[PDB]
């Protein structure tokens, strides 16, 4: 019954892609939707059975790689952590499949889109249900391949291809980091299986020689794994791919980049917690990177005008929050916020796509307004999603973000203070741009054109059922799962997550701090909402400062253009490497220098030597 | 080209395995850093020079030098992961690379040209070729589930155990390998058509479909269950690892 | 020739500058209620300089206007989705005409 | 266009809609159901549950490896 969970999306993809000519645009949708939905219900029984029944299942099919001791078999591991990711990934995938039935109603190549979605779901399931470090790597790179394929689903566009290739390059650096980490894991424990590594993760206390440096064996492995996590989760080091990856279809944004494949890094950190717990040096790096990513995305997302791009920076900020929540060695809260966000961010993307599709694919907030009366349902749904995202009290986003912030406060260390400060300011910024997105799209006086308003149609049934289900989730699931995941002394996780007794600060997070700290996110959210209203709905529009102050214009350009990452990084790395490819390696090393000392550059003097033999 | 890349490039490595790694165990150890230095820069230089090539057959021909220099890192590691994993790479390379030259041969037979500039938008006129070409693009860029990844990863774990630095430098090979492999596919297959240059098309015939079938089957069969090939070699490659050693 | 070409070309450059400045002004002032006064002032910039008649002083004014516009220009302008540089551009383009597909390409004898 | 109707693709092409996609859809389900039976039978055989469930779970109807690995000292 558990192999069916993983292989139903694979069979659906293999049918809809190999025999889509016989099923058409409707049969290919039915196959994939039915297969993923059956996998989702099977994941529901898996949750009732493993997570709630407290009986994990371990399933090994056949050995994959069998060297002397490099054994990485075809093993599947379903524990409490895996099942949560299953019920998130597969449920969101089924809802996205149902959404795309009506979204891809006029696009010609709908069957290939659904085949790609099913193969992506299959790769994500192989990622989450991975017993080894290699099956995990198999899914970790198949998910990148599927995202690349889906980003340029419209191959005729040029921006889509550029975004897809940039995403592949960034994910390739991440994969290099992950591969180095996996190589480090095998050199220590002589195994790649999770059970043996997590069982023997405490004994080794030796030092290695890595790249002319003497480092700690466990710390180096943890840092190398975190490099891969940064690559996939779009953290401070490698994140420029995610905002550019919005050139794909909206359902691609809602599943490929909102709920899944950005939480892959967080899931890998949480799963490898019995190993990250013994390298305190790596936790500092994780905390710093998460705080930096959250603040940077929050600052970048406040001046964007594209509807889809604003939400991408919200996703980046939420992933940063999860990352430095893992950095405080509290993985239960990280997974809780992951599951919470996978609801009210998928809802946000789906509602934004519903607005865009009805607006003749208009993506600029400067050219929409007064849509609240025209789009009642979608306005309500985006209101629910935004209120959950900002962390409105007694809502799905309130039971996780507030806990993360108060936990960061009570981590009385140098790294914890930095994360607390950045996560506190990011709440204000998140409230500001979330409410700006809500205000400009729906409540400001109309700025659109006559043709867009004339051709308006709200979401039909296939695009409304997933929305309503996600709204119910974003209303109640956080409260329902608050007790089992971030409760005191809960045994829901069982052995999935390990938190050492020394670094356990969950109890003090609740009653050790002033009540003001527990109300800082709400006050900052209210301040951000007030600022957004006062700058958008009613204002003299002092933008003349942006037309008279040179610094203000450059400051506006700094936040708008992703902190000048794409421009600077391109010129100083990509262009430099492109020159390094031709102007030296091809132009001088192997062009004529070998030739001139080779067989014909100067060795053709035999013509000037053999002809002289007549003497 | 299939003979030159499929087999003629496997004489050097086989010659090293049969007559060098055993007849001189002491000489091999002394020259191990020398081979690591040559192979590390060859992987970096060749995988980088590949980006600035414009000929279809001159790009894949540069994808073999990087792959074949990754093999010589595996052989000189002198362990089961290294030597044993280097053999799978050559079998994988002998199938992946020779299949890519069939794909180029398909394009050249119809349209007598090899410049990447003339090619584009074939995804809309030659879909079976695009599907087959993409699959071998994935194999060439070391994707798991393909025969190349098994050999590529086994070499890395065989060299990390001997020298962490050389395994780091060789790991950037798959960074650059995945760069041009997909970037070539985007140019040739994806994009808009160019009716000014070329306008008549014909997808794969019966021969081309059938010819690629053993490559497709033999590439995933080695990529998902390489135990069939591995278990036939461990007795022979383990006696190769130690010859002068007696402990 | 100057009275018909050397002076009239500037009369077209000024139109181009006015168009680009108006579009940029609409881009900066998101709300339509605020764009009106900004556009009125923008045209008042041009409407005050109509008193000139000699080329000796107008040309540097046009150069300065282009220099000013080039630095207060919006970093992220608005582009129609199906217009070039837009988001919907080349999404599902009409396939080119004249392209034909042949059958039985490689057949022995 | 006019030429994309002369190109054979496995996926089906642009705006593909066969006259008998209803019958083909029904067959595809039955084929998927037939290939899913051995996978389910295989899964119920190779799966291991070291821990007895808190409450009667549906997997006890077919799976039989419940509380079998408790003697891990004699594992191979």
């Amino acid at each position: 019954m558990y192999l069916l969970i993983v292989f139903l999306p694979l069979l659906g993809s293999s049918v809809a892609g190999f025999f889509g000519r016989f099923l058409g645009s409707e049969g290919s949708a039915i196959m994939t939707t039915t297969c993923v939905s059956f996998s989702s219900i099977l994941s529901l029984i898996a949750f009732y059975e493993v997570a709630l029944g407290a009986s994990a299942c371990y399933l090994r099919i056949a050995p994959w790689i069998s060297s002397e001791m490099f054994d990485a078999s075809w093993g599947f591991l379903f524990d409490s952590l895996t099942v949560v990711m299953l019920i998130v990934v597969t449920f969101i995938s089924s809802l996205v499949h149902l959404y795309s039935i009506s979204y891809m109603s006029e696009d010609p190549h709908s069957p290939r889109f659904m085949c790609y979605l099913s193969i992506f779901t299959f790769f994500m399931l192989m990622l989450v249900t991975g017993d080894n470090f290699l099956q995990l790597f198999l899914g970790w790179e198949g998910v990148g391949l599927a995202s690349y394929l889906l980003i340029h689903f419209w191959f005729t566009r040029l921006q889509a291809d550029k975004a897809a290739i940039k995403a592949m390059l960034v994910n390739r650096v991440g994969d290099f980091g992950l591969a180095l980490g996996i190589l480090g894991c095998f050199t220590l424990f002589q195994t790649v299986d999770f059970s043996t590594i997590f069982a023997c993760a405490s004994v080794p206390r030796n030092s290695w020689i890595f790249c002319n440096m003497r480092l700690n064996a466990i710390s180096l492995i943890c840092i190398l794994l975190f490099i891969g996590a940064v690559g996939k989760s779009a953290q401070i080091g490698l994140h420029t791919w995610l905002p550019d990856a919005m050139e794909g279809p909206t359902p691609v944004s809602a599943l490929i980049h909102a709920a899944t494949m950005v939480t892959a890094g967080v899931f890998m950190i949480a799963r490898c917690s019995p190993l990250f717990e013994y390298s305190p040096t790596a936790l500092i790096v994780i905390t710093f990177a998460g705080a930096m990513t959250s603040f940077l995305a929050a600052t970048t997302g406040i001046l964007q005008n594209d509807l889809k791009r604003v939400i991408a920076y919200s996703t980046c900020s939420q992933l940063g929050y999860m990352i430095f929540a893992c950095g405080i060695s509290n993985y239960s809260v990280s997974v809780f916020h992951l599951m919470n966000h996978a609801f009210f961010k998928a809802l946000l993307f789906l509602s934004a796509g519903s607005v865009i599709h009805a607006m003749s694919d208009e993506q600029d907030m400067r050219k929409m307004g007064g849509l609240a009366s025209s789009f009642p349902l979608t306005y309500a749904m985006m209101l629910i999603g935004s209120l959950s995202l900002i962390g409105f009290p007694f809502l799905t986003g309130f039971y996780s973000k507030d806990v993360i912030l108060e936990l960061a406060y009570t981590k009385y260390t140098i790294s914890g203070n930095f994360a607390f400060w950045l996560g506190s300011v990011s709440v204000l910024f998140t409230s500001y741009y979330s409410f700006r997105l809500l205000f400009l799209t729906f409540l400001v006086p109309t700025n659109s054109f006559g043709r867009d308003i004339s051709r308006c149609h709200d979401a039909p049934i296939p695009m409304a059922i997933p929305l309503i289900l996600l709204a119910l989730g974003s209303l109640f699931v956080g409260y329902l799962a608050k007790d089992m995941m971030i409760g005191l002394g809960t045994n829901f996780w069982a052995n999935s997550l390990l938190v050492l007794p020394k670094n356990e600060i969950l109890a003090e997070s609740e009653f050790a701090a002033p009540t003001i700290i527990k109300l800082i996110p709400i006050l900052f959210s209210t301040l951000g909402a007030f600022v957004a209203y006062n700058v958008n709905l009613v204002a003299d529009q002092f933008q003349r400062a942006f037309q008279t102050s040179t610094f203000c214009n450059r400051l506006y350009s700094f936040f708008n253009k992703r902190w000048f990452f794409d421009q600077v990084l391109n010129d100083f790395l990509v262009r430099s490497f492109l020159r390094f490819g031709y102007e030296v390696s091809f132009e001088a090393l192997d062009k004529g220098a070998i030739e001139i000392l080779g067989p014909y550059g100067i060795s053709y003097t035999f013509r000037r030597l053999a002809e002289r033999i007549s003497q | 080209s299939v003979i030159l890349a499929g087999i003629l490039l496997k004489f050097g490595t086989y010659g090293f395995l049969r007559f060098s790694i055993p007849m001189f165990p002491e000489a091999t150890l002394c020259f191990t850093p020398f081979i690591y230095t040559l192979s590390a820069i060859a992987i970096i230089y060749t995988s980088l020079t590949t980006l600035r090539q414009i000929d279809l057959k001159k790009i894949i021909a540069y994808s073999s030098v990087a792959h074949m220099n990754l093999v010589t890192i595996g052989m000189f590691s002198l362990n089961i992961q290294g030597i044993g994993g280097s053999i799978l790479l050559m079998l994988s390379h002998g199938l992946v690379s020779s299949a890519l030259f069939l794909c180029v041969g398909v394009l050249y037979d119809r349209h007598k040209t090899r410049l990447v500039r003339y090619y584009g938008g074939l995804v809309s006129t030659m879909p079976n070729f695009s599907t087959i070409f993409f699959f071998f693009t994935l194999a060439n860029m070391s994707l798991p589930g393909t025969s190349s990844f098994i050999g590529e990863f086994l070499i890395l774990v065989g060299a990390f155990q001997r020298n962490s630095l050389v395994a780091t430098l060789a790991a950037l090979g798959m960074i650059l390998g995945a760069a041009y492999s997909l970037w070539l596919y985007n140019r040739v297959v994806s994009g808009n058509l160019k009716p000014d240059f070329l306008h008549k098309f014909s997808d794969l015939n019966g021969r081309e479909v059938f010819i690629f079938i053993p490559f497709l089957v033999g590439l995933v069969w080695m990529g998902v269950y390489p135990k069939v090939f591995l278990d036939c070699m461990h007795t022979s490659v383990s006696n190769l690892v130690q010859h002068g050693k007696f402990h | 020739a100057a009275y018909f070409a050397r002076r009239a070309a500037q009369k077209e450059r000024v139109r181009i500058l006015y168009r680009r400045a108006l579009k940029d002004t609409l881009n900066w002032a998101v709300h339509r209620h605020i764009f009106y006064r900004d556009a009125s002032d923008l045209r008042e910039k041009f409407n005050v300089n109509q008193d000139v008649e000699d080329v000796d002083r107008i040309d540097k004014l046009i150069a300065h206007g282009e220099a000013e516009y080039n630095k207060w220009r919006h970093p992220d302008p608005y582009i129609v989705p199906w217009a070039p540089g837009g988001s919907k551009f080349c999404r599902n383009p009409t396939p080119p005409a004249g392209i034909e597909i042949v059958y039985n390409y490689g057949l022995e004898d | 266009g006019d030429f994309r109707a002369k190109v054979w693709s496995m996926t089906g092409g642009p705006n593909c809609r066969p006259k008998h996609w209803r019958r083909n859809t029904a067959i595809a389900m039955f084929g998927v159901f037939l290939v899913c039976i051995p996978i389910a039978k295989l899964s119920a055989k190779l799966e291991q549950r070291p821990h007895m469930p808190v409450r009667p779970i549906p997997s006890q109807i077919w799976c039989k490896n419940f509380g079998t690995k408790d003697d891990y000292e004699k594992e191979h």
Partner: peptide, 27 residues
Amino acid sequence: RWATPGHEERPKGYFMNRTPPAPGQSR
């Protein structure tokens, strides 16, 4: 949309780009 019979009687384009043989004959 979900009830109307399709228009494409046979899949577009011949398989392996080979014309079907004469009626009552074989490839």
